Amino acid sequence: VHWSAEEKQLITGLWGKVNVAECGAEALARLLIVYPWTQRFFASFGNLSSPTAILGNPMVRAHGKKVLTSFGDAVKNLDNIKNTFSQLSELHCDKLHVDPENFRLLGDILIIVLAAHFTKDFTPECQAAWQKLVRVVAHALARKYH
Amino acid sequence: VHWSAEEKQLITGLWGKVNVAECGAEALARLLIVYPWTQRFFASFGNLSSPTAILGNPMVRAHGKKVLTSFGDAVKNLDNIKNTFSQLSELHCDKLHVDPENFRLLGDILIIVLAAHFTKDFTPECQAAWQKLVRVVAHALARKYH
Amino acid sequence: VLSAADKTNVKGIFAKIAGHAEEYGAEALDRMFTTYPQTKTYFPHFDVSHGSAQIKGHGKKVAAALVEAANHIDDIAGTLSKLSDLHAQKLRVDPVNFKLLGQCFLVVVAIHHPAALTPEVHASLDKFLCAVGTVLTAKYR
Amino acid sequence: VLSAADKTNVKGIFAKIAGHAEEYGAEALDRMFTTYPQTKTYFPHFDVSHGSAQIKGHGKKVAAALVEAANHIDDIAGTLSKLSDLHAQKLRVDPVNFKLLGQCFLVVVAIHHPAALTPEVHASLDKFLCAVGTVLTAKYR
Ligand code: HEM
Numbered sequence: 151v152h153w154s155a156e157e158k159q160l161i162t163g164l165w166g167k168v169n170v171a172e173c174g175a176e177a178l179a180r181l182l183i184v185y186p187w188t189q190r191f192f193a194s195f196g197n198l199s200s201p202t203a204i205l206g207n208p209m210v211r212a213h214g215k216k217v218l219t220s221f222g223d224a225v226k227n228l229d230n231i232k233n234t235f236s237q238l239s240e241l242h243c244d245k246l247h248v249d250p251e252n253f254r255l256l257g258d259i260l261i262i263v264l265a266a267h268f269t270k271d272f273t274p275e276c277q278a279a280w281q282k283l284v285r286v287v288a289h290a291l292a293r294k295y296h
Numbered sequence: 297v298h299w300s301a302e303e304k305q306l307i308t309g310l311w312g313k314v315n316v317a318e319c320g321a322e323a324l325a326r327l328l329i330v331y332p333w334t335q336r337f338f339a340s341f342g343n344l345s346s347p348t349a350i351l352g353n354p355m356v357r358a359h360g361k362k363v364l365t366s367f368g369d370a371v372k373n374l375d376n377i378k379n380t381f382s383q384l385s386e387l388h389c390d391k392l393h394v395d396p397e398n399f400r401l402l403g404d405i406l407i408i409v410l411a412a413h414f415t416k417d418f419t420p421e422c423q424a425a426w427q428k429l430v431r432v433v434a435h436a437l438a439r440k441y442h
Numbered sequence: 443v444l445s446a447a448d449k450t451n452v453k454g455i456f457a458k459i460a461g462h463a464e465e466y467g468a469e470a471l472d473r474m475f476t477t478y479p480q481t482k483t484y485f486p487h488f489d490v491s492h493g494s495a496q497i498k499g500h501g502k503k504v505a506a507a508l509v510e511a512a513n514h515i516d517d518i519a520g521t522l523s524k525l526s527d528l529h530a531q532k533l534r535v536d537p538v539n540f541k542l543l544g545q546c547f548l549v550v551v552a553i554h555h556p557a558a559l560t561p562e563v564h565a566s567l568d569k570f571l572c573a574v575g576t577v578l579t580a581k582y583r
Numbered sequence: 584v585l586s587a588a589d590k591t592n593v594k595g596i597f598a599k600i601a602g603h604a605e606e607y608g609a610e611a612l613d614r615m616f617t618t619y620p621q622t623k624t625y626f627p628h629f630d631v632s633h634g635s636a637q638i639k640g641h642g643k644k645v646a647a648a649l650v651e652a653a654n655h656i657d658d659i660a661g662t663l664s665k666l667s668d669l670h671a672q673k674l675r676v677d678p679v680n681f682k683l684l685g686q687c688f689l690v691v692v693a694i695h696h697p698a699a700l701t702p703e704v705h706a707s708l709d710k711f712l713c714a715v716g717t718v719l720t721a722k723y724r
Pocket residue numbers: 188189191192194216217220221242246248252253256257287288
């Protein structure tokens with residue numbers, strides 16, 4: 151996959167301003183509130199019943215961060231994501247058999263979350279870099295399939 | 297991906313008894329019918345005003361013919377599909393620009409066809425090599441993307 | 443939605459089904475298994491092998507409900523407004539999977555009736571087979 | 584498909600978005616080309632450059648009917664079918680882009696009302712967008 155010197159800035163630049171804590175809680179909380187199907191996989195966490203509770207429960211408010219922080223690992227190397235999420239791609243496919251369209255449903259949820267914490271500080275041309283990222287992510291985690 | 301002793305046989309053997317003109321013909325046609333949006337894709341095929349004008353549009357069946365024959369070049373290339381479709385992925389991806397959701401669609405309609413022409417000759421255990429088959433083909437048709 | 447003409451292709455195929463409910467379903471499901479085995483995990487409490495009394499059992503409902511649903515095609519989300527609550531909330535099913543049954547459910551009809559599933563009548567079913575899938579995943583939409 | 588809690592959430596976000604449709608629609612659209620250059624094929628006699636005349640005169644209508652659909656929701660499926668042709672029959676849009684516009688429309692809202700588009704309101708719209716999603720692709724299902 152191709153990346154550039156301008157997409158490297160929109161990405162590496164904005165990464166170092168993400169309050170991972172909250173947005174990783176925000177977007178896992180949303181996934182769980184947005185597509186309610188997405189709740190089955192997270193049975194082990196407890197109370198996910200009322201949309202507002204979903205955020206109050208602090209396993210998501212914890213496990214959420216591990217998603218965004220996850221995305222951390224990538225940013226260090228846009229040029230070996232393949233080998234990065236690969237060990238991680240075994241974890242979502244073999245063990246907890248997760249349908250990758252959902253790898254599109256948090257990527258899309260997680261761009262929306264940046265979207266509300268960076269206002270016009272979130273460039274049309276930016277967002278794009280950030281899809282390409284969580285698009286490249288999405289399908290890395292789906293290496294251990296076809 | 298792994299093909300085995302019980303997998304090679306049903307692919308190779310069923311392949312050798314498919315009327316590639318008919319099966320290809322009813323293939324492209326269901327897609328042309330069942331999902332009316334792809335017709336723009338084949339706008340330079342002419343009269344595509346009605347299910348019956350569609351089935352008989354000679355060039356429809358002069359297309360289905362070249363699509364099921366393709367698969368056949370893969371039928372012989374199991375462990376080698378990626379290289380096989382190389383250029384033909386650059387056709388759909390970079391050129392034509394078909395949303396990979398359609399590889400599956402024209403995929404799942406093919407399957408549908410094996411059941412029509414072959415009825416009981418289409419075992420559960422057969423179906424699945426005509427699944428995986430079609431999935432893997434679809435996956436290379438998506439190689440010049442991510 | 444589904445319109446005057448859809449309302450007769452679909453009504454079409456289920457009439458031609460109708461008497462072999464229990465098979466087509468059981469059979470749709472086996473194919474729902476040996477083709478997409480990552481569907482299995484909703485049935486770890488169930489005998490998933492070709493033609494046990496279980497896929498037979500569970501099969502006739504899957505077929506029965508779908509029929510009861512064309513009998514009153516005019517309201518699929520209230521005739522099945524008992525079955526949506528279940529699926530969408532406790533088993534919680536990924537829609538990805540309704541598209542694995544559906545298609546798998548078509549692939550059955552084909553084997554048993556290739557001249558009833560004419561591409562025009564094929565069209566309306568996948569249609570029907572969306573809306574049922576929708577209805578039953580309604581606790582999301 | 585769209586109950587009471589939804590109706591209230593959906594109506595809400597709207598009279599919020601309302602009096603800035605001539606730029607909430609242009610933005611959205613200005614974002615679906617710049618993240619998604621493939622949707623550009625539907626626009627080859629369009630001025631695609633940043634801030635141009637044809638996009639803002641357009642985008643205006645993408646909400647102009649996005650909110651006419653909002654303030655008449657009891658029947659989205661009817662008020663929008665007019666276009667459900669222009670979309671389903673005339674231009675024929677791949678349904679996999681109602682999304683790519685579904686979203687780039689929630690990258691706008693988000694930017695300008697990040698404290699209104701709570702998850703639940705985010706849900707209703709994204710399900711109302713799944714409403715204006717299906718109706719506009721009527722000709723297939
Ligand atoms: C945006 C793409 C995603 C990324 C990058 C990601 C990343 C991660 C990470 C970093 C872990 C940490 C494991 C640990 O702490 O031991 C994890 C585990 C897990 N993931 Fe994901 N994830 C994504 C999407 C999803 C989706 C859609 C689901 C399913 C709804 C999912 C389901 C899970 C589950 C159920 C666990 C572990 C549960 C447990 O600890 O018992 N992930 N993932």
